[PDB]
């Protein structure tokens, strides 16, 4: 069986030195250096993997189009659907309850 | 997959020098080609055709040029034609015998 | 290196538009998603940061300030707490019971977290193995093993 070598000058099996063996069009077995697999972006509210956003390395987000990095909702690329939905229900209901507390305090202005 | 295949061996070079004749070569071929690895099985599944200078076999059962070359070298070794005769191939299933 | 858990809390800045994070020692029962109220008018609830003078006798407090504004000195290890023995409003003060049993009187403006530090009962399990003591001290400091002087 054919045996391979590191192509760079790092001789140690570190994270940034992982290789995969590939067969070449010349027929021989060679090493191919593979980099760190990308981690998917996570929602800031719950940490769950964001759906509808491509998983790349941080620098490759500079050259990719906006559609890949976001989704078509409010807070689209930063919080997933269920979190923004929870924020929508929460925002409306607290402000509604605020108007309730505002009139409960306001009766004392009529009483006095 | 069961289509018939036609393998040809051009014996022209040995025959012109008159050292190797197809009359005995074809008889050895039909006697020693085996299908199912047993006896009594040359039932018109493979048949060898000799014209005198170009000898061919046709097969409706399984048969290969590997087998043909293997059997031919057996015959050439048997009658001491090796080191003089080579079983060569021009194209696919288009073998021949060479003196060089 | 700390037995006690820590709590990351986000307060708003009253003077600028910015979220200010603070590193509190987690008291038992505090959960993520919980509001904690810090100040003199904060309610007596586990996790709130009342001044010592604002709490009644017998209040169980932790991470108590030695001086008002030092940001907490006493009863910070896992399972530890401070008790409020009483108050001395004239020359505004408050006497408390420290985890060692010591009695100490300090200013009533010193703040603390209501409740007991979480992670209590840690020393109730035998380490059982030199290796467990090894891992314990490798995140603390180089104080282990100990050769006897004799």
């Amino acid at each position: 069986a054919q045996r391979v070598t590191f192509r760079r000058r790092n001789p140690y099996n570190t994270r940034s030195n992982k290789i995969k063996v590939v067969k070449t069009p010349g027929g021989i077995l060679r090493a191919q250096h593979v980099k760190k697999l990308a981690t998917r972006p996570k929602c800031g509210d719950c940490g769950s993997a964001l759906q509808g956003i491509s998983t790349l390395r941080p620098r490759q987000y500079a050259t990719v189009s906006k559609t890949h990095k976001t989704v078509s909702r409010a807070y689209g690329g930063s919080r997933c659907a269920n979190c923004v939905k929870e924020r929508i229900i929460r925002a409306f209901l607290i402000e509604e309850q605020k108007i309730v507390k505002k009139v409960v305090k306001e009766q004392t202005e009529a009483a006095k | 997959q069961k289509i018939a295949k036609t393998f040809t061996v051009d014996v022209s070079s040995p025959t012109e020098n008159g050292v190797f004749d197809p009359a005995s070569y074809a008889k050895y071929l039909i006697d020693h080609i085996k299908v199912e690895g047993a006896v009594g099985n040359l039932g018109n599944a493979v048949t060898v055709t000799e014209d005198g200078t170009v000898v061919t076999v046709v097969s409706t059962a399984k048969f290969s040029g590997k087998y043909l070359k293997y059997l031919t070298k057996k015959y050439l070794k048997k009658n001491q034609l090796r080191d003089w005769i080579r079983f060569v191939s021009t194209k696919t299933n288009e073998y021949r015998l060479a003196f060089y | 290196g700390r037995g006690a858990p820590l709590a990351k809390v986000v307060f708003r800045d009253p003077y600028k538009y910015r979220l200010r994070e603070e590193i509190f020692i987690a008291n038992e029962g505090v959960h993520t998603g919980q509001f904690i109220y810090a100040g003199k008018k904060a309610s007596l609830n586990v996790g709130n940061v009342l001044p010592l003078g604002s709490v009644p006798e017998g209040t169980i407090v932790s991470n108590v300030e030695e001086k008002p504004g030092d940001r907490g000195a006493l009863a910070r290890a896992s399972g530890n707490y401070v008790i409020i023995i009483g108050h001395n409003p004239d020359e505004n003060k408050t006497r408390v019971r420290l985890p060692s049993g010591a009695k100490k009187v300090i200013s009533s403006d010193a703040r603390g977290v209501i409740g007991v530090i979480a992670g209590g009962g840690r020393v109730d399990k035998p380490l059982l193995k030199a290796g467990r003591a090894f891992h314990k001290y490798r995140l603390k400091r180089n104080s282990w093993p100990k050769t006897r002087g004799v």
Partner: protein, 91 residues
């Protein structure tokens, strides 16, 4: 199904450390690896991550608690005491 008479989870330590030390460890090791009830969601999903870190896998809430139990007996007493002193304002 009954593999050991008494060692239970401490059968991993085998014969070493003394029976009293293994007995003491057995008590707290069963407590620290047990599943607890989540008061927030009502399910039995509260795991210990590290000493004092209790995580519900359903509602994803983290509770500060004891080293080997979700709540120590001392904390529940302080819960009642702080509540009791709180109600003096109410009445």
């Amino acid at each position: 199904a009954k593999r050991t008479k008494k060692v239970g989870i401490t059968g991993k330590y085998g014969v070493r450390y003394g029976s009293s030390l293994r007995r003491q460890v057995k008590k707290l090791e069963i407590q620290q690896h047990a599943r607890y009830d989540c008061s927030f969601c009502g399910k039995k999903t509260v795991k210990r991550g590290a000493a004092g870190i209790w995580t519900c896998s359903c509602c994803k809430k983290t509770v500060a608690g004891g080293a080997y139990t979700v709540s120590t007996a001392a904390a529940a007493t302080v819960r009642s005491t702080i509540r009791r002193l709180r109600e003096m304002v109410e009445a």
